[PDB]
Every structure is written in C-alpha cells, then in structure tokens.
C-alpha cells in the first residue's frame, strides 16, 4: 500500500514501525492514514525542517536512541494531532523557542538521557493539555522561574540524576513537588547536587523557612520605605547636627557672657 | 543556605540615590524661586560652628578632619573586600562583622555631610559638588540593604571618589604648605582616584550584564583586572587580552578615552618631574684632621675652574694634601662634573651661597686654611662684579673673622674699599690682587725693560719641563718657562759673619738663582726667594751644609697741573723734541669704563730715578676720556697729552712715534661689546698702523706692546708667524717677545698666593715701584698722592734697586759677549759690581745661522751656568741707586 514507508512494517490501524533499520534521515513519503510511528534507534542526527510533513493525523512519534543533537524550530509543523512524543536517549543539548508551540495535543513529551543544561520558558511554549513530563538523566542545573507557569495540567514530572543546585532559582519548582507529592521510591531519588549544606537532602524536605532569605515578591510597604529611607535619614542627620550645634553655641555663649568678669 | 539570588531589584538602592539627590535639588530650587517670588545671629554663629569644625582650626576639627581621612581609606579598602563577593546576595546584618564596619562608617559620612552643608555658603552649588554626589550615592544604599538583608555591590565605587579631598585635608592640618608638594598631591589623587572609579564603573557594567539583553553578557571580571584594563587603555598600549565586551562597557570605554588619555598623557610626566625635584650637590663637607682644606667660591665655571686645578694641583710643588672644596650656587653641568670626577680624591662640590650663614657652616670656613674667590674678569660691568666680590668677602668675614682670603678686584679703588672691612687682618694673612694694577705694574715694567712682563708672569704659572727636537726658538724659550717662584728658609752655615757676601756667587754650589723683610739684590731667620725649576731641589739649601719727592720719598711729586696746561697740539708736539720716551695711545668713547693709569706712571717714578732719567709720558686720544681721568693725573710730572686718536697717522708722527722708548695701546670699550669677534678691534688696527708706518725706515720694529681683552686675537698682532688656536697663549711668539699681555696669565697668582703669601708683596715690591703699610693708609684715607719737605730719613729710604736693560755690544762685558758661560757672566756681574741678572733677552733669529733681518727678541729665564751666549743680546738687572 502507497500509505506505508517502502523500507517500514506497517500494520491496519496506522501503526508503523522504522525501527532497527539505519535510516539516516526520516523516511520519504509520510501518509494521513498513519497515527503512530516509530523511528527508534537510528543514526537521524540532524532533523529537516516539515520533516514528518504529510503525516499530519499522526497520534504518536518514537525518536528514542536516534542520536539528535539539533533540532529545528519548524520541523514539527502542522503535527497538531500528535500526542506522544519520545525524544529521550539523545544529544539534545539547546531547544530552539517555538519549537514545540504546534503540540497543541501533546500529552507526554520524553527529554530523558539529553544534555538539556537549560530549558527556558520559552521552549515548551504554550502546553496546556499536556499531562505529564519526564526531566530525568538531563544536565537541568535549574528550572527557570515561569516554566511550569505555562502547563496547567502538569501532574506528573521525574527529576531524577539532574545537576540541582538547591538555592532560590528553584524555588517554582518545589512548589509543584508540595501540591504534588512525589512517590516515595521516586521521592528518594531525587537530591540536590551542589556539595554545599544541602546534599543528600531530598527537594521535599525543603519548606518555606528554610528559604525566607529568598526574594520575595515586591510589596507596597517595601516600596514606599525604600523610596522614603534615603532623604528621612539625611534630613534626620541634618537636623541632629543643627540641634548639636545650636545647642553647643547656646551653652557656651551662656558660659562666656554670664562669667565675662569672672 | 546559599544561591540567594533569583530575581534582581537593583532599582530599589538606584531609585533610593536618585530620589533623594533629585528631591534635594527641587526643594532647593523650590526656595529658590520662592524667594523670587516672595542678638546676633543665631543661624550665622551654627553656621560659624560648623565652618571652624570642618577645618582644622580647633582640636575637634583636626579630630574629625583626620577621621574623615582615615574613615575615606576605611571605606574604600571595605568596597575592595566586597568587590570579591557576588554582584548581589544576601547576608544577615547582626550575623557579620563587615556590614557593621561599614554602617558605622557611612553613619560617620552622613555626620559629616550634615556639618558641610550646615557650614556651606551656598546650598544649591554645594548640593552638586562630587563630594556631596558621591554621599548621595553611597549611603542610602548601605542602610536600605542593611533594612532589607540584602548587598547589592552597586555604585560602591564612587567610594574612590571620596579620595579626591585629601589635598584640602592635608592643607587643612596645615601639612601641605608648599606649592610643589600640593600640586603634587592634588596630581595623585586625582589620577588615582579616576583610575579607581573607572575601574569600579567598568567591573559593576561587565560583571552585570547590559539589562536590554536580559543580562546575558556576564563577563565575570575581577576588580583588579578592571584596574589592570583600564590601565593599559589609558597608557594607550591596548593589550587586547582584556576588554570590554557589553555595549555599556564598550560605550564608557568610548566616552572615557577622550578625557582619559589626555589624564594620562598630562599627569603622569608632571608627576615624574615633581617627584624628580632634588639638591644632588647637598650635604655638608667632613673636616679630616691632619689634612686642610680651602674652599673656593666666586665665578665658578669651567674653564676657570680647570685652571685653577691644574695650576694648584702641579706635580712641581711639595707632596702637600690641601683639599679644594668648591661652593657655588649653580648646578654644575656635565662637563664640570666629569672635571670634578677626573679630580675624585681631591676636591669637592657643594651647591650654596656664600651669603648664607647655612651654607658656609656647610662648608666648614670655621675650620678652613683659606678661602678663594674668583672674579670674572670678562664681565660687562666691573663695578657689579666688584660689588658681587666684596658682598661675598663681607659674608665671609661676617661669618668668620679670621679666615684668610685671597680675593681678585677687577678696579683700584674697590680694593680701598676692602681695607675699609675691619677685619681685613692683613697681618696674619689676606691678600686682594688687583688685575687691573698687576696688569699695568707688569706694563710700566716692560716699559722700563722689554719683555719683562713675560717673564714675570711665566715665573708664576706652574710649568713643566718640555722638550722639542727641533732647533727653534721655542726650544730655548720652553727651557725658561719652567722656571717657578719658590721660597725656600736659609740654612745654618750661611747665618754666619755676613747674609749678603756669602748669599753672592754661591749660586754655583746651590744650582739656583736667589732674588727679615723683603729683599731684592741684598748687597751693602730669612726666606730665600729662589726662582728653581722644581720644588724637589729647593730643598738644597737649608739641607746641605758643605716738594721734590712724595711723603716717603718712595716716588716723586711736582705741583698739581691743570688740564688745559698740559693739553696740547700736532704743531707743539712736533716742535717738542722728545725720544726715548713712553706712548700711551688710549681707546674711550663718552659712556666707557674707567681704566685707570695711576698704577702705570706711579711705577715709572720710583725713587732710584734722577728727575733727568725720568722719563716722559704722553697720552694721546681722545680729550674726554683723559679728562674724566684727570682727577687723579694732576698731581704728577712731566706728563703731556695730545688729544686726537692713535688711529690718525698725524697725530702719531708730532709725539714722535719713531723714537719713542715704548708705545702702549690701552682699550677701555672692550667691556662694552660682549662679541668674540669684535674685540681689540681698534687696538689691532692700531698695532698694525704702528708697524706699517715709516720713518725719514719701518716702524715695524717699534717696541710696542698691546693689551688685549681676548687671547684668541693675539694671532692677528704679528704675520710671519704660525697661528693656531690650539697653541697657549705663552707659546704664542707675540707674548714670548713681551709684545702681547692679557689678565688671563694673572690667574695662576691665587695658586702661587696661597701657597706662599710673600710673593704677592714681593711683586708689589718688584713692580708699581714700591707699597709700603704707609702709603697704603695715606691713599685709603686721602686717595691721593702728596709729598712733603724732605728728610735725611726719607731721601735714606731709596737704596732700592730697579730693573734695567744692559747692552752687550760695548762695556766691560764684551769679552763675555760670546764667551760661551752665561754662568761666568753673571758671577762675574755679582763680584765685580753687586748685580743680578734674571736671565737673557735674545734674538728670535740668533740661534740660526743664517743672518736675517728680524728684531723680535724672546726672553730666557735663568740659562743653565753651561749656555753659549751671543754678542748681540740684552741683560736684565737690577741696577742699585746712586
Ligand atoms: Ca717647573
Ligand atoms: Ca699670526
Ligand atoms: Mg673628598
């Protein structure tokens, strides 16, 4: 049938399966009728841009042990239907921003075994029915305030052999940990990585009063004291020296013209 | 915990600084158009109280004055501790030691601001000072991060600013008085102070990163590589390892090339050449005993100096170490100071003025044989050179009394002057040599005999033996120059029955000529004046033993004349017979200097002279200058005077040039043009005319003798000669023939006066006829010559003997004519008639062969007892009175 990859298995239902063949690149000639597609263990090391363009329908994609290291911004266009995607086991070090915004219908998306030193917001993009995310085996030395911000649905997310620096940075993402209690075998696994004081102490551990010293948000008292606290203070000193010197002036001419003769 | 920082709020300390300097100018200049717009004072007497405090008029001030000093220091050394740290972080108030240093000094800041601007005149110009801003700036931020737990190293840097006022600190404390030690210190601080607060700029924009780029652009630079960056941008090297790389970084680099290298470029020369300014030649001189030192002041330069030196430090005196200290204000130049370095172990210098007490204790005159001043002769204006000598001798007597000075006085009457210093102790020792009457004693000498101002003055430089082997007449010449004047005590076998018969022909024993007071030809405890080549075989004689006259009657005086009875003209000076007689032409203008000529006919009149054998005196030239002159030329006799110009062949044919005894040409503008070229002028065109003249045959051979200002002229005086630059005046054939004289070969006597004092009076005794202590007090008290009746005692007072020409073509003497032995000639003048002869007048020529038409003659001083001799040759002696 024209609809499955000459060098691919394919079965009735839109399942097809590229997996363990050596493809370079991505197979040619994608068709509407598949909706889950596997790539696995490959040598894809560079992914075009509207690469699985035709496939549009497609429901899950499969890129685990593929050897990625760059991917572009456009190369999931017009993916809309696709749910599942399996990036993990690569060399993924940079994501471009925009990249995933498409996804509108991602639900689990796979970063395992990358190099990802950073994810910023501006990433993912915009994942609302996203359900579940796996961070694990990654170089995420922080998570950059507001990532989360933009997944409502998240319940579910692995942390696990991540370079955590535990410090104020990652103060959101704790706060998901609290509202959503890691399993305790999962619990276990995740530590913070800095040697300072707070190795082999689990992110949950962590509350509110140890990090006080934090930041916190800009208030309305705060505003005005620190406004005010620059010319109340000069204007203090200045009347204290004034008031020093009138009253030192005062004493001594009280001295000098009181005791002329004596 | 640690990583405190998420997210920045550096707007908080920024907006704090900006509100407060900002509100603060707005109130003020609210007041201000507000009043536009409409006891004693106790606001003036707070405002006084906090003007003493911040200067350092009371003890409170310079408390709080070097408070502010030390806390400035604080303050910066705590903003490079910080500088370490991260830009922001958080740290807890009673938990460190840093931040409550630092609260206590900003606290102290802030004092101290409240009592400058209660102190400040006006309110708005001080609210702008970099003082004032920098307060605004620094303070704030330190309480609002002690409010809120939290550093963030922000405009901290303007700290360095804070170093600027450390000049008015300083001269506050009235530390800094000077002006170089201020400009000095103004340079440095500001330098430093600039370098610092661009440095901090720098290191605050690149470690925070410029904010529209997210602050993505952290170059994480230590504040001493923003120090070691800006540095090589201002030296205008630019390494290119460091730089900035924001765009803020790159725009203050921008901005502050243009007004920082010209910083640089400006300051740092003027602070090497500040710092640069020291006495090299300070310090004081240590007195080694046993060893004397003299100290030498005065003109000081070069080519003086170097004279002196190797005129005094002469291989041909005794092994005596006197050590030269010289004292003069100037700095002495390169040359000078590699002349001071060839002469290490001997002499020293030492940058002073004699005028100052300091500086002659620096020198140690208390403890000084001697003290030297030099004059300079070829000065514009020997009245200010005189009156320089004489404030220096009088600075030095005022210093010290007894001190010993041997002085040159370029006029007569300045030396009057002298004597009227009482401490002028000429007993014990002091000396003042008159160029000017040295000079012209040595002039009115050649004038009685030819040539024997030559040999007088080569007896008084240090020569040594040379030796040329060719036969020339410089050969004969060099075996007499370096015959010196010595002084030598007398031994015991010669004290005996009688000095005089056995001081006479023992001269062959000694191998030396000899010349309780001054002697001279003693004939009818003594120092033996002997004329040997050497001071090592002095030490030969003690150590073998086997209305007429004046008021003295030491000159001679005649009624005083009147100028127009003496003036005369070509008509009755041509009818006047005169020969054998003596010339003066003289050179004056209306506004020349004095020369004066008393000192050149007084030596002409001395009492050993009969009024027939006197010989006559004209001065022709000009009538003003004999004129001015005239006050002291009217009391003498036998002087006539032609005005006219000695450049006017008339005028010199009525005086009768041809058979005149001696003409001397005499200069008095040459201290006006101070051009090398132009001078002697006017005496050269003279000389020449004298011998381009002829006669019902050439004047050529007229005894002439010119004194001439530059020694570099004494080329032009005769043509069939070898003329040289490089050749020494006294090698010259003008000066060897007595026909050339300059001061210049007067400045040995200061060597030859220390050493032995007696000579200086031997010479006022050998020339200028005779200066006795009482005709020195009757012309310091009168300053004119009288006379008297005369006395047994003072016609007694001439048994004197003066020099004399002796022929030797006819007289007893011509069987010694060409007998071979000089040595015989004169043992004989000595046993037959009592007479001495220095040596031989010889002509040029006659050590050649070949005959020739010549007449110059040399002068030889003291031929060896084997020298051959020629008929035609002249003798001088010293003739006794009749
Ligand atoms: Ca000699
Ligand atoms: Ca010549
Ligand atoms: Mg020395």
């Given at each position: 049938a024209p609809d499955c990859p000459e060098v691919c298995t394919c079965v009735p239902g839109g399942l097809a399966s590229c997996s363990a063949l050596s493809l370079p690149a991505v197979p040619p000639g994608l068709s509407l009728r598949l909706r889950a597609l596997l790539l696995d263990h490959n040598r894809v090391r560079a992914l075009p841009p509207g690469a699985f363009a035709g496939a549009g329908a497609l429901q899950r994609l499969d890129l685990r042990e593929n050897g990625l290291h760059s991917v572009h911004v456009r190369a999931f266009w017009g993916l809309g239907a696709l749910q599942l995607l399996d990036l993990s086991a690569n060399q993924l070090e940079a994501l471009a921003p925009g990249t995933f915004a498409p996804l509108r219908a991602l639900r689990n998306l796979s970063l395992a075994g990358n190099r990802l030193a950073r994810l910023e917001p501006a990433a993912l993009g915009?994942?609302?029915?996203?359900?579940?995310?796996?961070?694990?085996?990654?170089?995420?030395?922080?998570?950059?305030?507001?990532?989360?911000?933009?997944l409502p649905a998240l319940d579910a997310l692995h942390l696990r052999g991540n370079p955590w620096g535990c410090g104020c940075a990652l103060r959101?993402?704790?706060?998901?940990?609290?509202?959503?209690?890691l399993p305790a075998s999962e619990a276990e696994t995740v530590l913070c990585v800095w040697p300072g004081r707070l190795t082999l102490s689990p992110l949950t551990a962590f509350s509110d009063a140890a990090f006080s010293h934090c930041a916190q948000p800009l208030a309305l008292r705060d505003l005005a004291v620190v406004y005010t606290l620059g010319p109340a203070s000069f204007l203090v000193s200045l009347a204290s020296c004034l008031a020093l010197g009138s009253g030192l002036t005062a004493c001594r001419a009280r001295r000098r013209r009181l005791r002329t003769a004596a | 915990p640690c990583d405190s920082r998420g997210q920045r709020m550096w707007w908080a300390f920024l907006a704090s600084s900006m509100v407060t300097f900002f509100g603060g100018l707005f109130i003020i200049?609210?007041?201000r158009t507000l009043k536009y717009l409409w006891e004693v004072g106790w606001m003036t007497s707070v405002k006084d109280w906090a003007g003493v405090m911040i200067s350092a008029q009371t003890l409170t001030g310079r408390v709080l004055v070097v408070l502010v000093f030390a806390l400035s220091i604080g303050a910066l050394v705590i903003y490079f501790i910080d500088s370490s740290n991260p830009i922001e972080s958080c740290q807890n108030f009673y938990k460190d030691f840093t931040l409550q240093i630092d609260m206590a000094f900003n606290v102290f800041f802030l004092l101290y601001f409240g009592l400058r601007f209660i102190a400040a005149n006006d309110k708005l110009w001080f609210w702008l000072e970099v003082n004032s801003v920098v307060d605004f700036f620094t303070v704030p931020p330190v309480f609002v991060s002690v409010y809120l737990n939290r550093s963030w190293l922000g405009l901290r840097f303007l700290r360095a600013l804070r170093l600027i006022q450390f000049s008015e600190i300083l001269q506050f404390l009235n530390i800094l008085k000077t002006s170089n030690s201020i400009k000095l210190v103004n340079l440095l601080s500001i330098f430093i102070s600039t370098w610092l607060t661009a440095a901090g700029f720098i290191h605050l924009v690149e470690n925070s990163g410029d904010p529209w780029e997210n602050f993505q652009n952290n170059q994480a630079l230590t504040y001493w590589e923003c120090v070691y960056l800006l540095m090589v941008t201002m030296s205008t090297v630019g390494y290119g390892d460091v730089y900035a790389k924001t765009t803020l970084g790159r725009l203050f680099m921008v901005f502050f090339i243009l007004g920082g290298l010209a910083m640089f470029a400006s300051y740092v020369p003027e602070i090497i050449e500040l710092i640069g300014n020291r006495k090299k030649y300070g310090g004081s001189y240590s007195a080694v005993s046993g060893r004397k030192h003299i100290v030498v002041c005065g003109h000081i330069t070069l080519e003086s100096v170097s004279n002196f030196l190797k005129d005094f430090l002469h291989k041909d005196r005794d092994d005596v170490n006197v050590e030269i200290v010289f004292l003069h204000n100037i700095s002495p130049n390169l040359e000078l100071e590699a002349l001071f370095k060839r002469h290490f172990t001997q002499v020293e210098f030492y940058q002073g003025s004699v005028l100052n007490p300091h500086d002659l204790a620096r020198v140690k005159i208390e403890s000084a044989d001697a003290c030297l001043i030099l004059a300079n002769k070829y000065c514009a204006d020997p009245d200010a050179e005189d009156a320089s000598n004489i404030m220096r001798v009088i600075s030095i007597k005022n210093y010290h009394p007894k001190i010993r000075i041997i002085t040159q006085m370029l006029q007569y009457h300045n030396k009057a002057h002298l004597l009227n210093i009482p401490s002028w102790n000429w007993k014990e020792g002091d000396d003042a040599i008159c160029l000017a009457e040295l000079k012209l004693g040595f002039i009115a000498q050649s004038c009685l005999a030819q040539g024997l101002s030559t040999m007088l003055a080569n007896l008084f430089s240090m020569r040594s033996f040379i030796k040329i082997e060719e036969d020339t007449w410089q050969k004969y010449y060099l075996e007499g120059v370096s015959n010196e004047m010595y002084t030598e005590y007398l031994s015991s076998a010669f004290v005996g029955l009688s000095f005089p018969t056995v001081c006479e022909l023992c001269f062959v024993k000694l191998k030396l000529l000899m010349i309780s007071r001054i002697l001279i030809n003693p004939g009818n405890g003594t120092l033996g004046f002997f004329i040997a080549s050497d001071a090592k075989e002095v030490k030969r004689a003690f150590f073998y033993c086997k209305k007429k006259y004046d008021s003295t009657g030491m000159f001679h005086w005649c009624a005083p004349k009147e100028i127009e009875k003496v003036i005369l003209t070509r008509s009755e000076a041509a009818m006047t017979v005169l020969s054998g007689h003596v010339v003066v032409c003289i050179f004056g203008d209306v506004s020349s200097a004095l020369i004066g000529l008393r000192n050149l006919v007084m030596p002409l009149r001395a009492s050993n002279f009969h009024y027939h054998e006197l010989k006559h005196i004209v001065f022709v030239g000009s009538?003003?200058?004999?004129?001015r002159e005239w006050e002291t030329l009217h009391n003498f006799p036998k002087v006539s005077i032609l005005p006219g110009t000695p450049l006017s062949r008339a005028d010199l044919r009525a005086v009768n040039i041809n058979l005149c005894d001696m003409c001397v040409i005499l200069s008095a503008n040459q201290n006006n043009i101070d051009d090398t070229s132009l001078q002697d002028k006017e005496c050269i065109l003279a000389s020449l005319n004298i011998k381009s003249m002829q006669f019902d045959t050439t004047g050529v051979n007229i005894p002439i003798i010119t004194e001439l200002v530059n020694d570099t002229n004494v080329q032009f005086l005769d043509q069939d000669d070898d003329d040289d630059p490089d050749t020494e005046l006294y090698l010259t054939q003008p000066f060897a023939c007595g026909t050339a004289f300059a001061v210049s070969v007067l400045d040995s006597l200061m060597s030859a006066t220390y050493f032995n004092d007696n000579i200086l009076t031997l010479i006022?005794?050998?020339?200028?006829?005779?200066?006795?202590?009482?005709?020195?007090?009757?012309?310091?008290?009168?300053?004119?010559?009288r006379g008297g009746y005369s006395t047994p005692q003072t016609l007694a007072n001439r048994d004197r003997c003066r020099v004399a020409q002796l022929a030797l073509l006819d007289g007893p003497?011509?069987?010694?004519?060409?007998?071979?032995?000089?040595?015989?000639?004169?043992?004989?003048?000595?046993?037959?008639?009592?007479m001495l002869c220095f040596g031989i007048y010889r002509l040029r020529d006659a050590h050649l062969s070949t005959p020739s038409q010549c007449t110059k003659r040399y002068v030889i001083t003291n031929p060896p007892y084997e020298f051959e001799l020629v008929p035609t040759d002249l003798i001088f002696c010293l003739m006794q009175f009749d």
């Open positions: 915009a994942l609302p029915l996203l359900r579940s995310l796996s961070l694990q085996d990654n170089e995420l030395a922080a998570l950059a305030p507001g990532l989360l911000g933009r959101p993402l704790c706060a998901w940990l609290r509202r959503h209690p | 200049l609210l007041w009538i003003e200058y004999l004129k006022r005794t050998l020339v200028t006829g005779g200066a006795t202590p009482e005709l020195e007090a009757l012309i310091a008290e009168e300053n004119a010559l003497f011509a069987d010694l004519g060409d007998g071979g032995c000089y040595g015989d000639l004169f043992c004989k003048a000595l046993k037959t008639y009592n």
